[PDB]
């Protein structure tokens, strides 16, 4: 109807999760840099920060009850190899880099 099998509201959600996942990867260093810097400008990244520590060691993927783990684990595997061309995930992320 509105698009093919691979392009529903779940892909709009991967674009949202991608940004939180990449922020979480950076944000995890701010606390380690001093030991008590718990503050953040986007508190919602805590969900990804917790999930990253799980998915980096998890192996239950096809049946892992943590939906966010199997979800986030697939995003970087796609992005890393897709970088050679334009894509709904890779294109906005590449364009954002112009800001600093």
């Amino acid at each position: 109807a509105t698009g093919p099998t691979a392009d529903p509201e779940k892909r709009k959600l991967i674009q949202q999760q991608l940004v939180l996942l990449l922020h979480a990867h950076k944000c995890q260093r701010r606390e380690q840099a001093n030991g008590e810097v718990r503050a953040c400008s986007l508190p919602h990244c805590r969900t990804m920060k917790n999930v990253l520590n799980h998915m980096t060691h998890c192996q239950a993927g096809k049946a892992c009850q943590v939906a966010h783990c199997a979800s986030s684990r697939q995003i970087i595997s796609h992005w890393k190899n897709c970088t050679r061309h334009d894509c709904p995930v890779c294109l906005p992320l590449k364009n954002a880099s112009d800001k600093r």
Binding site: A6, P8, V19, S71
Partner: protein
């Protein structure tokens, strides 16, 4: 500079409007339920058409 920056993610948060989040929804990229980069192979017509 050769990689992404935390303020570049903050710029994409503002571009997308993610500052308005409240609860994170679910997805199943590790299952057939959402094969995020597949093709429109599901196109078919029921046995009642025969």
């Amino acid at each position: 500079t050769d990689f992404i920056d935390e303020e570049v993610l903050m710029s994409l948060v503002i571009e997308m409007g993610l500052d308005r989040i409240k609860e994170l929804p679910e997805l199943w990229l590790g299952q057939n339920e959402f094969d995020f980069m597949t093709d429109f192979v599901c196109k078919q017509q029921p046995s009642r058409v025969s």
